[PDB]
Design a protein around this ligand. Structure first.
Ligand SMILES: CCCCCCCCCCCCCCCC(=O)O
Length: 133
């Protein structure tokens, strides 16, 4: 299953193209400004076969709990109500969110002890790097 090397608390240290990513999602300007300013913390944890990914920022906190490969209801930070599935592919945690006939993917993998999130919406690709705290 998911490597335990994912487990822990992670701090955003880099973001690239997040603004176009948020635009692609339909996020408005004032909200994009706060999203570009945010340096969130991501806490990954597990209890049994339930994985929890919690995101904490001054603007918005979010949290999802799921079992691999089982679709669940998610409320995103920009308040989309999505049906989502997290899968494991070559050590990459891959989240797909679907709503209103659209789809975005967030792929999280470990690289030299950092966590790299790649976010994809309509060909826009955003890259966010996190360091373990
Ligand atoms: C990310 C929380 C704070 C900013 C909230 C602004 C609303 C836009 C959210 C878009 C989806 C966020 C995807 C984040 C991917 C990651 O975990 O790095």
């Amino acid at each position: 299953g998911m490597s335990n090397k994912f487990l822990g608390t992670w701090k955003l240290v880099s973001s690239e193209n997040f603004d176009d990513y948020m635009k692609a999602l339909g996020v408005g300007l004032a909200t994009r400004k706060l999203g570009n300013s945010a340096k969130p913390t991501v806490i990954i944890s597990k209890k049994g076969d339930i994985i929890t990914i919690r995101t904490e920022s001054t603007f918005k906190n979010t949290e999802i709990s799921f079992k691999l490969g089982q679709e669940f209801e998610e409320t995103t930070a920009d308040n989309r109500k999505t049906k989502s599935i997290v899968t494991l592919q070559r050590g990459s945690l891959n989240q797909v969110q679907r709503w209103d006939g659209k789809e975005t993917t967030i792929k999280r993998k470990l690289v030299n002890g950092k966590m790299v999130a790649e976010c994809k919406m309509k060909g826009v690709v955003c890259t966010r790097i996190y360091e373990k705290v």
